[PDB]
Ligand binder design. Structure first.
Ligand SMILES: CCCCCCCCCCCCCCCCCC(=O)OC[C@H](COP(=O)(O)O[C@@H]1[C@H](O)[C@H](O)[C@@H](O)[C@H](O)[C@H]1O)OC(=O)CCCCCCCCCCCCCCCCC
Ligand SMILES: CCCCCCCC/C=C/CCCCCCCC(=O)O[C@@H](COC(=O)CCCCCCCCCCCCCCC)COP(=O)([O-])OCC[N+](C)(C)C
Ligand SMILES: CCCCCCCC/C=C/CCCCCCCC(=O)O[C@@H](COC(=O)CCCCCCCCCCCCCCC)COP(=O)([O-])OCC[N+](C)(C)C
Ligand SMILES: CCCCCCCC/C=C/CCCCCCCC(=O)O[C@@H](COC(=O)CCCCCCCCCCCCCCC)COP(=O)([O-])OCC[N+](C)(C)C
Ligand SMILES: CCCCCCCC/C=C/CCCCCCCC(=O)O[C@@H](COC(=O)CCCCCCCCCCCCCCC)COP(=O)([O-])OCC[N+](C)(C)C
Ligand SMILES: CCCCCCCC/C=C/CCCCCCCC(=O)O[C@@H](COC(=O)CCCCCCCCCCCCCCC)COP(=O)([O-])OCC[N+](C)(C)C
Ligand SMILES: CCCCCCCC/C=C/CCCCCCCC(=O)O[C@@H](COC(=O)CCCCCCCCCCCCCCC)COP(=O)([O-])OCC[N+](C)(C)C
Ligand SMILES: CCCCCCCC/C=C/CCCCCCCC(=O)O[C@@H](COC(=O)CCCCCCCCCCCCCCC)COP(=O)([O-])OCC[N+](C)(C)C
Ligand SMILES: CCCCCCCC/C=C/CCCCCCCC(=O)O[C@@H](COC(=O)CCCCCCCCCCCCCCC)COP(=O)([O-])OCC[N+](C)(C)C
Ligand SMILES: CCCCCCCC/C=C\CCCCCCCC(=O)O[C@@H](COC(=O)CCCCCCCCCCCCCCC)COP(=O)([O-])OCC[N+](C)(C)C
Ligand SMILES: CCCCCCCC/C=C\CCCCCCCC(=O)O[C@@H](COC(=O)CCCCCCCCCCCCCCC)COP(=O)([O-])OCC[N+](C)(C)C
Ligand SMILES: CCCCCCCCCCCCC
Ligand code: NA
Lengths: 482, 113, 138
């Protein structure tokens, strides 16, 4: 007899291998989920005391986490909404029903290996995934993962996130007054004279503290994850810009004590980054978060494609103009700077008479303000519209992943603060284990309504006689018997 | 402006004024948050850099709103000490606000309409 | 025998309760409008002098106004385009035909409880609805 439990060279059991072979196509997904069922059901007939899905390969990955780490949404959807109606293979179910009074029926989804579990949570493996990892953004649309995060959101993370937005706003209001009201005489550092000059130092000291704070939070993000050079520049666009803000802050400290006026050069960048980084905190809000995802995508596809061709044209005709100029705008900066005034609607077509050919000068600028202003800016708008039409759902599902990483980091930041995460669930008796003992599980309730499957003599209902939460129920002497 | 109320006796003008309502609420309010964050953001960064006039937060926020309406001088001060800082900071502004975020607004409206 | 006319704690009769249970999905709408018909037709066989739809709950709402105040467009569409071809349940029709010469046929829609009526007009209940009140616009 073959061994259901046996492992390969890489430690993958049969069920792990059903995950490696999945390819996110329907006929494969139709099959693998069918075959995932049968061996998983067979392993209750033979070897009834094993729990295959708890088996971990060489990389410590279960078949569920391996489906989530490898982008396998169909298998993930199967494993998570799994309901098995057979009696001796019911404990292997994962989507239960706790009551059904008419069209209403309250489902229970187990939360084993999804919440902040021991080895690899499905939320962590999805949320903290590498960037290739297909369907990062669709793996959370698999029910109950939306509702589970939206539960964590509405219960503890929303009230914490808005406190994080506040303490960051105050920090930006304080680093801004400490910068607006800076000394404009003498070299740094600057002694204290009056009371107004005492308040700013409280604002300057306290402002460096956040830079130290946002500096270590970027080191933690580095060592808690170990992101590759790729992942570092391609999906971590927030942590880059808070850490970068932190570097201009510390450079602003290194230079404020090195007697050099360049502290201002770094201090103003750290402001402009900082206020732009409130667009981070638009991710507690669905409409503003999706708006800020679109800003991300526009910068990366539409504007970067744009600014290459625009800088090629700009520097191209710029050299052609300053070459023609003779003794002032006989510089490459002032000509590149005047040719950028056209796109912003501030272009004088007669910013020099210091040339010798006027047809050459204006044919060359008309060539510029047709191919850049008329064509390439209005083309940009057209490209954005094409983009917005496409990334509408993609931006909603990058948002939910943004919010998810905030939910997880909030949980993981408060292992000590409150207690852990408030557990996002309840320990319910779904039935009995095949050895007769109780099957208590941390389960997420989802009320559902159905106007087509009226009769549905379920039986698999786990606590029908009490038909709700209410007080403790009867357990319904049906299918369970122990 | 409240004559735009009375466009509702007319099917084409009424529907036009409903779109104006929706644009203000979803497209423009989303826009003006991010625009005022950027504006006030780089504004503080500019007036911080300025030394003695446009050494004010109003006149800098007011000059940085001239860019979106196409009236932005990239040399409205020489009263600074760092010119790379001053122009990298305004180019950062008139790319992320004018090039990106206004033309993005048009794109959002088209999606809305 | 059950009482077609009886009321619950909140005053909702059976037909009011057919409105509260509607959820603007097709299979529910297919059903509730079917079942709305049958009790409404049954109430002409038994108790032929009642007019159930005129019954008002604790909040003074009829099943039509409650369908319009609660966003129930499928039930509203049913109640308003209601044409019953059976003879003894024809008075319970609401969309009539006054003539049909060839392909042309002139329909009549009752305007009871839509125009500026006494308690709650369907236009007022729709027009002066709270903002959640799904399908205000449909
Ligand atoms: C030679 C030069 C060397 C340079 C080396 C160092 C470079 C460091 C910066 C790199 C980046 C520079 C800017 C250009 C890149 C784009 C910026 C942007 O839009 O990224 C959106 C970001 C999203 O977050 P996240 O990462 O959480 O989202 C990820 C992400 O969607 C991922 O795809 C998902 O899979 C994942 O699930 C999800 O989680 O959102 C924010 O970062 C908040 C909003 C921030 C504001 C966004 C507007 C633009 C900001 C930049 C301009 C700053 C202006 C002041 C400049 C002053 C000095 C000139
Ligand atoms: C000391 C003073 C500091 C300054 C004042 C601020 C202090 C800090 C303030 C902290 C509190 C944060 C605001 C909470 C508002 C209520 C929440 C709510 O229900 O929102 C609703 C929408 O609401 C919006 O979309 C509002 C605009 C969102 C953008 C951010 C506004 C922040 C306000 C202040 C800006 C300050 C800027 C910086 C200023 C320096 C619900 O959201 P949704 O759209 O439904 O999406 C939710 C997701 N879901 C629906 C999928 C579940
Ligand atoms: C990304 C930047 C965005 C913002 C900038 C946007 C513009 C593009 C920026 C481009 C960056 C380079 C700027 C110019 C070179 C440095 C200065 C220098 O020494 O210039 C010398 C080269 O003289 C010339 O005429 C230039 C020759 C080509 C140099 C640039 C190579 C292509 C760079 C990419 C080009 C874009 C296409 C490809 C990329 C898409 C002389 O010129 P000068 O500067 O006067 O030097 C002092 C001379 N003086 C002693 C008489 C005073
Ligand atoms: C896309 C593929 C590549 C295209 C290549 C295109 C380039 C091919 C073209 C090549 C020829 C370019 C001109 C050569 C030099 C002529 C003299 C000159 O420049 O100035 C002279 C006269 O200045 C004037 O302004 C008077 C008119 C001059 C001739 C104008 C010809 C217009 C041709 C239109 C052709 C349209 C072509 C459209 C193409 C799409 C000297 O005078 P000034 O001191 O300089 O003038 C100042 C005094 N003022 C105020 C009294 C005037
Ligand atoms: C004392 C002097 C005061 C000033 C003069 C004005 C005096 C007051 C004037 C009162 C009369 C109002 C105009 C009536 C026009 C004819 C109606 C008609 O058939 O319209 C047609 C379209 O027509 C339009 O759409 C026209 C433009 C509509 C916008 C408003 C124009 C008002 C003109 C004056 C502006 C003044 C602005 C303020 C100036 C201070 C039909 O409409 P529709 O598009 O088919 O849609 C109908 C709905 N339906 C089709 C679904 C059924
Ligand atoms: C909605 C408005 C749209 C139109 C406005 C658009 C811009 C945004 C509007 C913002 C409203 C607030 C304006 C500034 C504060 C009031 C004035 C004051 O005392 O400033 C002090 C604070 O000095 C600073 O440098 C400012 C520090 C932060 C203050 C604003 C907090 C964030 C507000 C939201 C920011 C947006 C991002 C978040 C929200 C999306 C000093 O500066 P001052 O003013 O010179 O004071 C006199 C000083 N003097 C004696 C030396 C002369
Ligand atoms: C439905 C939609 C349509 C309806 C819309 C309804 C309205 C929408 C708009 C609303 C904006 C209204 C703003 C308030 C009125 C104007 C400002 C004012 O009074 O300035 C006065 C004082 O101002 C200050 O002292 C402000 C200092 C902070 C600067 C930030 C605001 C800059 C104003 C512009 C931001 C533009 C942002 C544009 C984008 C939002 C004048 O300043 P001053 O005395 O000459 O100099 C003092 C300088 N100092 C004190 C800073 C050193
Ligand atoms: C998005 C995430 C964050 C991004 C952070 C980005 C910031 C990182 C950058 C940081 C460095 C910024 C500059 C530091 C200070 C240098 C000196 C200075 O400014 O002026 C000095 C010289 O003024 C000049 O104009 C001469 C050239 C100065 C150096 C230019 C470097 C350009 C680097 C391009 C890098 C492109 C980076 C693009 C980034 C996308 C002092 O002279 P002045 O009196 O001021 O001059 C006036 C007299 N004049 C008319 C003769 C000139
Ligand atoms: C995430 C996206 C948003 C954030 C983005 C953040 C970054 C955004 C932007 C980034 C661009 C930053 C550019 C460097 C800083 C400014 C230049 C500088 O220091 O000039 C100094 C020196 O400059 C020179 O000498 C340059 C010579 C080459 C000219 C080409 C660049 C012209 C700059 C503009 C191109 C505009 C292009 C606009 C479109 C790209 C000042 O020059 P000067 O001493 O007075 O005169 C010397 C002249 N000569 C030496 C040439 C003879
Ligand atoms: C809803 C949120 C957005 C709207 C509100 C935004 C905030 C309020 C809006 C606008 C600010 C208005 C101007 C502030 C006073 C001027 C500067 C000053 O006196 O001290 C210094 C800087 O100031 C600081 O660093 C902050 C502390 C200021 C002192 C008074 C306590 C304020 C506490 C605030 C606690 C944090 C903020 C509140 C949250 C905890 C001045 O330094 P200096 O080198 O001596 O320069 C001389 C200046 N002087 C001659 C004019 C004296
Ligand atoms: C004169 C004035 C009178 C009034 C004064 C008023 C005072 C006003 C208040 C604050 C002023 C600034 C104090 C420092 C905080 C900076 C801002 C900050 O932390 O924002 C964070 C909130 O932060 C929190 O929710 C926790 C608060 C900070 C704790 C550590 C403070 C730094 C000390 C030294 C620590 C050194 C060791 C570091 C490890 C402990 C931002 O939230 P986040 O969740 O981090 O998300 C951003 C990061 N991410 C986007 C990249 C994910
Ligand atoms: C406006 C914020 C502070 C700008 C100066 C930075 C240098 C350090 C100042 C205070 C000392 C911190 C240790
Ligand atoms: Na203009």
């Amino acid at each position: 007899t073959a061994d259901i439990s046996a492992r390969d060279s890489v430690g993958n059991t049969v069920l792990h291998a059903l995950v490696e072979v999945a390819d996110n196509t329907a006929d494969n997904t139709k099959f693998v989920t069918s075959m995932y069922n049968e061996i998983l059901m067979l392993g209750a007939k033979l070897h009834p005391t094993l729990k295959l899905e708890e088996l971990t390969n060489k990389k410590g990955m279960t078949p569920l986490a391996l489906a989530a780490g490898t982008g396998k949404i169909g298998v993930l959807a199967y494993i998570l909404q799994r309901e098995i109606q057979e009696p001796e293979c019911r404990h292997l179910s994962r989507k239960f029903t706790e009551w059904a009074y008419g069209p209403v029926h309250s489902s229970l989804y187990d939360l084993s290996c999804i919440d902040t579990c021991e080895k690899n949570s499905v939320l962590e493996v999805i949320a903290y995934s590498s960037s290739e990892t297909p369907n990062r953004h669709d793996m959370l649309l698999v029910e109950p993962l939306n509702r589970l995060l939206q539960d964590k959101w509405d219960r503890f993370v929303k009230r914490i996130f808005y406190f994080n937005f506040l303490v960051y706003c105050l920090y930006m209001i304080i680093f801004t007054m400490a910068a607006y009201y800076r000394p404009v005489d003498g070299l740094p550092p600057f002694k204290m004279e009056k009371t107004g000059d005492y308040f700013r130092v409280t604002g300057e000291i306290l402002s460096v503290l956040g830079g130290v704070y946002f500096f270590f939070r970027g080191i933690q993000y580095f060592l808690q994850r170990r992101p590759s050079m790729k992942t570092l520049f391609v999906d971590s666009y927030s942590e880059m810009l808070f850490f970068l803000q932190s570097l201009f802050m510390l450079a602003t400290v290194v230079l404020y004590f090195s007697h050099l006026k360049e502290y201002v050069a770094s201090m103003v960048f750290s402001l402009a980054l900082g206020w732009t980084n409130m667009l981070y905190y638009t991710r507690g809000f669905q409409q503003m978060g999706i708006y800020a995802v679109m800003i991300e995508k526009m910068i990366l596809r539409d504007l970067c494609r744009f600014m290459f061709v625009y800088i090629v044209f700009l520097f191209g005709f710029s050299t052609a103009v300053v070459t023609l100029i003779e003794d002032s705008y006989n510089s490459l900066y002032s000509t590149c700077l005047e040719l950028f005034k056209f796109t912003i609607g501030m272009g004088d077509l007669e910013f020099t008479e210091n040339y010798d050919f006027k047809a050459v000068f204006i044919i060359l600028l008309l060539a510029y303000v047709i191919l850049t202003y008329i064509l390439l800016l209005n083309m940009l708008i057209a490209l954005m519209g094409e983009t917005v039409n496409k990334i509408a759902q993609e931006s909603k599902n990058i948002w939910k992943l943004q919010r998810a990483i905030t939910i997880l980091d909030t949980e993981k930041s408060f292992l000590k603060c409150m207690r852990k995460a408030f557990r996002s669930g309840k320990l319910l008796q779904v039935g009995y284990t095949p050895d007769g003992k109780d099957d208590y599980r941390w389960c997420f309730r989802v009320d559902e309504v159905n106007w087509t499957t009226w009769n549905t003599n379920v039986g698999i209902i786990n606590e029908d006689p009490g038909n709700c939460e209410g007080v403790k129920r009867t357990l319904s002497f049906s299918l369970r018997s122990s």
